[PDB]
Amino acid sequence: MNPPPPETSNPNKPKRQTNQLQYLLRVVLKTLWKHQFAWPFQQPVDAVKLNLPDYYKIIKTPMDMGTIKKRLENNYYWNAQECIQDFNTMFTNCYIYNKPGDDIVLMAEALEKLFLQKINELPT
Numbered sequence: 001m002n003p004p005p006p007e008t009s010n011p012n013k014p015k016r017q018t019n020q021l022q023y024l025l026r027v028v029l030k031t032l033w034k035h036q037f038a039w040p041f042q043q044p045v046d047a048v049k050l051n052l053p054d055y056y057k058i059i060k061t062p063m064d065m066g067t068i069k070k071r072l073e074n075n076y077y078w079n080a081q082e083c084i085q086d087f088n089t090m091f092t093n094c095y096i097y098n099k100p101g102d103d104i105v106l107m108a109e110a111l112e113k114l115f116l117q118k119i120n121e122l123p124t
Protein backbone atom coordinates (compact mmCIF):
# COMPACT_ATOMS: atom_id res chain seq x y z
CA MET A 1 0.00 0.00 0.00
CA ASN A 2 3.05 2.27 -0.31
CA PRO A 3 3.38 3.98 -3.68
CA PRO A 4 6.77 4.49 -5.35
CA PRO A 5 8.50 7.41 -3.56
CA PRO A 6 9.27 10.64 -5.55
CA GLU A 7 12.23 10.41 -7.89
CA THR A 8 15.59 11.75 -6.73
CA SER A 9 17.31 11.37 -10.09
CA ASN A 10 16.22 12.23 -13.59
CA PRO A 11 18.95 12.44 -16.26
CA ASN A 12 16.60 14.18 -18.69
CA LYS A 13 15.95 17.09 -16.36
CA PRO A 14 18.17 20.15 -16.76
CA LYS A 15 20.11 20.71 -13.53
CA ARG A 16 21.97 23.65 -12.08
CA GLN A 17 24.19 24.14 -9.08
CA THR A 18 23.25 27.65 -8.01
CA ASN A 19 24.39 29.48 -4.88
CA GLN A 20 20.93 29.45 -3.37
CA LEU A 21 20.56 25.74 -4.01
CA GLN A 22 23.87 25.07 -2.27
CA TYR A 23 22.62 27.20 0.65
CA LEU A 24 19.33 25.26 0.86
CA LEU A 25 21.31 22.08 1.30
CA ARG A 26 24.15 23.38 3.45
CA VAL A 27 22.30 25.80 5.66
CA VAL A 28 18.59 25.34 5.37
CA LEU A 29 17.97 21.61 4.96
CA LYS A 30 20.84 20.53 7.22
CA THR A 31 19.57 22.85 9.95
CA LEU A 32 15.98 21.63 9.74
CA TRP A 33 17.36 18.08 9.60
CA LYS A 34 18.77 18.31 13.11
CA HIS A 35 15.66 19.82 14.70
CA GLN A 36 13.88 17.93 17.54
CA PHE A 37 10.79 17.63 15.34
CA ALA A 38 12.45 16.72 12.03
CA TRP A 39 12.37 12.97 12.40
CA PRO A 40 8.87 12.26 11.02
CA PHE A 41 9.74 14.20 7.90
CA GLN A 42 13.13 12.66 7.15
CA GLN A 43 11.69 9.86 4.96
CA PRO A 44 8.54 9.12 2.97
CA VAL A 45 5.39 8.40 4.98
CA ASP A 46 5.28 4.61 5.35
CA ALA A 47 1.53 4.13 5.30
CA VAL A 48 2.08 0.41 5.85
CA LYS A 49 4.36 0.75 8.87
CA LEU A 50 2.01 3.34 10.45
CA ASN A 51 -1.07 1.38 9.44
CA LEU A 52 -2.52 4.46 7.77
CA PRO A 53 -3.63 2.98 4.45
CA ASP A 54 -5.77 6.07 3.94
CA TYR A 55 -2.75 8.42 3.74
CA TYR A 56 -2.00 7.81 0.09
CA LYS A 57 -5.74 7.76 -0.60
CA ILE A 58 -5.65 11.44 0.36
CA ILE A 59 -2.15 12.65 -0.35
CA LYS A 60 -1.43 12.40 -4.05
CA THR A 61 1.77 14.41 -4.35
CA PRO A 62 3.94 13.09 -1.50
CA MET A 63 7.13 14.82 -0.40
CA ASP A 64 9.62 14.54 2.43
CA MET A 65 12.87 16.06 3.58
CA GLY A 66 14.72 12.84 2.84
CA THR A 67 13.60 13.06 -0.78
CA ILE A 68 14.46 16.79 -0.88
CA LYS A 69 17.86 16.10 0.65
CA LYS A 70 18.59 13.40 -1.91
CA ARG A 71 17.46 15.73 -4.72
CA LEU A 72 19.78 18.44 -3.41
CA GLU A 73 22.77 16.08 -2.99
CA ASN A 74 22.14 14.73 -6.52
CA ASN A 75 21.68 18.16 -8.04
CA TYR A 76 18.15 17.57 -9.20
CA TYR A 77 16.91 21.15 -9.18
CA TRP A 78 17.17 23.95 -11.74
CA ASN A 79 16.68 26.73 -9.20
CA ALA A 80 15.90 27.31 -5.53
CA GLN A 81 12.24 28.10 -6.00
CA GLU A 82 11.77 24.56 -7.27
CA CYS A 83 13.26 23.12 -4.08
CA ILE A 84 11.29 25.53 -1.88
CA GLN A 85 8.20 24.40 -3.62
CA ASP A 86 8.88 20.76 -2.61
CA PHE A 87 9.34 21.94 0.96
CA ASN A 88 5.98 23.67 0.71
CA THR A 89 4.41 20.48 -0.63
CA MET A 90 5.71 18.55 2.34
CA PHE A 91 4.20 21.01 4.84
CA THR A 92 0.94 21.36 2.97
CA ASN A 93 0.60 17.57 2.85
CA CYS A 94 0.85 17.43 6.61
CA TYR A 95 -1.76 20.18 7.05
CA ILE A 96 -4.02 18.51 4.49
CA TYR A 97 -4.07 15.05 6.04
CA ASN A 98 -4.02 16.13 9.70
CA LYS A 99 -5.95 18.67 11.72
CA PRO A 100 -5.05 21.83 13.66
CA GLY A 101 -3.87 20.77 17.08
CA ASP A 102 -2.48 17.35 16.11
CA ASP A 103 1.01 16.79 17.45
CA ILE A 104 2.39 16.09 13.97
CA VAL A 105 1.04 19.47 12.88
CA LEU A 106 2.74 21.29 15.76
CA MET A 107 5.96 19.71 14.53
CA ALA A 108 5.30 20.75 10.91
CA GLU A 109 4.33 24.30 11.91
CA ALA A 110 7.47 24.56 13.99
CA LEU A 111 9.68 23.28 11.18
CA GLU A 112 7.90 25.58 8.78
CA LYS A 113 8.59 28.70 10.82
CA LEU A 114 12.25 27.77 11.04
CA PHE A 115 12.17 27.13 7.31
CA LEU A 116 10.59 30.48 6.45
CA GLN A 117 13.00 32.24 8.77
CA LYS A 118 15.97 30.53 7.08
CA ILE A 119 14.92 31.29 3.53
CA ASN A 120 13.87 34.88 4.23
CA GLU A 121 17.37 35.83 3.08
CA LEU A 122 19.10 33.75 0.39
CA PRO A 123 22.57 34.27 -1.12
CA THR A 124 22.90 36.53 -4.18
Ligand SMILES: Cc1ccc(S(=O)(=O)Nc2ccc3c(c2)N(C2CC2)C(C)(C)C(=O)N3C)cc1
Nearest residue numbers: 039040041045050052055093094097098103104
Ligand atom coordinates in the same frame (compact mmCIF):
# COMPACT_ATOMS: atom_id res chain seq x y z
C1 LIG B 1 3.42 13.50 16.92
C2 LIG B 1 3.71 12.25 16.12
C3 LIG B 1 2.69 11.12 16.07
C4 LIG B 1 3.03 9.88 15.26
C5 LIG B 1 4.35 9.79 14.52
S1 LIG B 1 4.74 8.33 13.59
O1 LIG B 1 5.61 7.56 14.43
O2 LIG B 1 3.56 7.50 13.55
N1 LIG B 1 5.51 8.47 12.14
C6 LIG B 1 5.00 9.46 11.28
C7 LIG B 1 5.87 10.16 10.38
C8 LIG B 1 5.30 11.19 9.53
C9 LIG B 1 3.76 11.49 9.60
C10 LIG B 1 2.95 10.85 10.46
C11 LIG B 1 3.55 9.74 11.37
N2 LIG B 1 1.48 11.20 10.47
C12 LIG B 1 0.69 11.55 11.64
C13 LIG B 1 -0.43 10.63 12.09
C14 LIG B 1 0.83 10.74 12.92
C15 LIG B 1 1.08 11.47 9.25
C16 LIG B 1 0.87 10.24 8.35
C17 LIG B 1 -0.30 12.06 9.17
C18 LIG B 1 1.94 12.64 8.53
O3 LIG B 1 1.39 13.48 7.86
N3 LIG B 1 3.23 12.59 8.71
C19 LIG B 1 4.09 13.57 8.12
C20 LIG B 1 5.34 10.93 14.58
C21 LIG B 1 5.02 12.16 15.39
